[PDB]
Amino acid sequence: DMYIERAGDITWEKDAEVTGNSPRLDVALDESGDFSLVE
């Protein structure tokens, strides 16, 4: 029996920590909703 608990408001935070890169990848999506890399 799954249950939910509030974790916060959905708002943009000014001066939030900035990280992560922006890769461009060729991918395929199968009928089961799984993404895979196409090379």
């Binding site: 939910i4 608990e5 939030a16």
Partner: protein, 156 residues
């Protein structure tokens, strides 16, 4: 139960202790999460029950109490924020410039941020605070790291 708009943890008592299996968004009385988090099962909110309303395994999305309400899209130019809700940890906004998933059926925004599997369903937002998609379905690239698609439904 609690129906106030916001981000929520999805918990289960089936496994050891109380385990967080994912995250979701409550908006306009509808609860939005990823299919792999709940597998479409019913949810509890206090003494109330949330019943599934719509879902699709290929999109990896599910809505409860009503149809999918989130219809904002990434503009393809601007930075976004992942409002990450990791298991046992406080909600935290992380700003990033999305990458791209190029598919035979079009391009999708992607976020290269590494979080535990129980973070799936955390919302990705634009500068107006609108949810442009959910984090948690993507791929593992060469280094072993994670890149998630920005998964968004359709508002009928």
């Amino acid at each position: 139960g609690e129906t106030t708009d916001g981000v929520y943890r999805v918990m289960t008592r089936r496994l050891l202790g109380s385990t967080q299996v994912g995250v979701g968004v409550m908006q306009e009385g509808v609860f939005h999460t990823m299919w792999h988090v709940t597998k479409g099962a019913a949810l509890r909110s206090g003494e109330g029950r949330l019943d599934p309303y719509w879902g699709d395994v290929k999109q990896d999305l599910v809505s409860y109490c009503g149809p999918w309400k989130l219809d904002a899209a990434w503009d393809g130019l601007s930075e976004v924020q992942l409002l990450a809700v990791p298991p046992g940890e406080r909600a935290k906004n992380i700003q990033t410039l999305p990458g791209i998933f190029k598919t035979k059926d079009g391009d999708i925004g992607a976020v290269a941020l590494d979080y535990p599997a129980g973070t799936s369903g955390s919302p990705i937002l634009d500068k107006c605070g609108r949810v442009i998609g959910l984090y948690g379905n993507g791929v593992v690239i060469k280094n072993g790291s994670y890149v998630s698609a920005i998964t968004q439904g359709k508002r009928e």
